[PDB]
């Protein structure tokens, strides 16, 4: 199944929600994330792990970027819309709202987590269309399948002609 | 391995190069693609895949979109520098560059083709800057793992700090 991230931006405040894990790479901030369930949409996903690993409540926005390894995981843009802490102890070793300028330049998260902020930055300071992307589900033609296609958004007018 | 297609775009003629298979879906327009080979660069495979099937000699410029099913298939915005089709018999029944407008309203092609073709018409009108995606290799933290990051195009200046 799908992985899925949630990176809770508030662009009231300029913050971002992180974690460090109890048990994995405890110095690294990362953001929270796990696997979809089977009929989960992909911003579903994000929104329930964001809530069970750190309280806070939000809504998907977009999605930021896709990693691909040897399979996929799904980095999504979401909104708070509650504020107050209550991490799963299970889990977490911390979880802040920490300053985004400060997560785009410290050395202690990924190399990805830290490209995630940096586009995040970009979007906060020049607007978050050049960096929104969406999924949609699209049918296939030689058989029954369906895919999910990720792109930049596409104005209405355009995606009817 | 993941499979890579090539949506080349003349940008002075607004034509978009497809094909017709052979031997499936012998009606639906669509684009070059297949599988890339071990080692080979997402856009090397584009750029092959396309030469192969058309003749065509192109550039790659971005990615477009990710199509994922139940694994991963990147189509790509190339830009071609020879114009002179040359098609593979073997494998394709027809192949023209056809009005990128044409495309965009046609329906003897498929959703996800045609879905791209409004992204091109939209990048046309209105910038690349609007639809193109970069991918990069970022090194995992845990593991000696590599991934493949998809995402907007990120000014130099951010990526950097």
């Known amino acids: ?3 899925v991230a949630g990176a809770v931006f508030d662009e009231s405040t300029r913050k971002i929600l992180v974690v460090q ?4 790479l405890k110095n690294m901030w990362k953001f929270p994330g796990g696997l979809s369930e089977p009929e ?7 929104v329930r792990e964001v809530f069970e690993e750190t309280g806070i409540k939000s809504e998907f926005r977009s999605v930021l970027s896709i990693r691909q390894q040897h399979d996929m995981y799904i980095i999504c843009r979401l909104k708070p819309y ?5 991490f799963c ?3 977490c070793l911390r979880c802040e709202w920490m300053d985004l300028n400060d997560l785009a330049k410290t050395e202690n998260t ?10 995040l930055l970009y979007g906060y300071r020049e607007g ?3 960096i929104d992307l969406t999924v949609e589900e699209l049918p296939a033609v030689y058989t029954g ?17």
Chains 1, 2 share one sequence.
Do not use: C, W
């Not at 894990?21 to 994995?24: A, S, T, W």
């Open 82 to 86: 509650s504020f107050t802490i209550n």
């Open 1 to 3: 199944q799908v992985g």
């Open 128 to 130: 978050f269309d050049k």
């Open 89 to 91: 102890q299970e889990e």
């Open 110 to 119: 990924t190399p990805i987590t830290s490209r995630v902020a940096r586009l």
């Open 145 to 161: 399948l369906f895919y999910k296609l990720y792109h930049k958004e596409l104005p209405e007018n355009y995606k009817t002609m």
């Open 40 to 46: 989960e949409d992909i911003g579903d996903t994000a």
């Open 21 to 24: 894990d109890r048990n994995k």
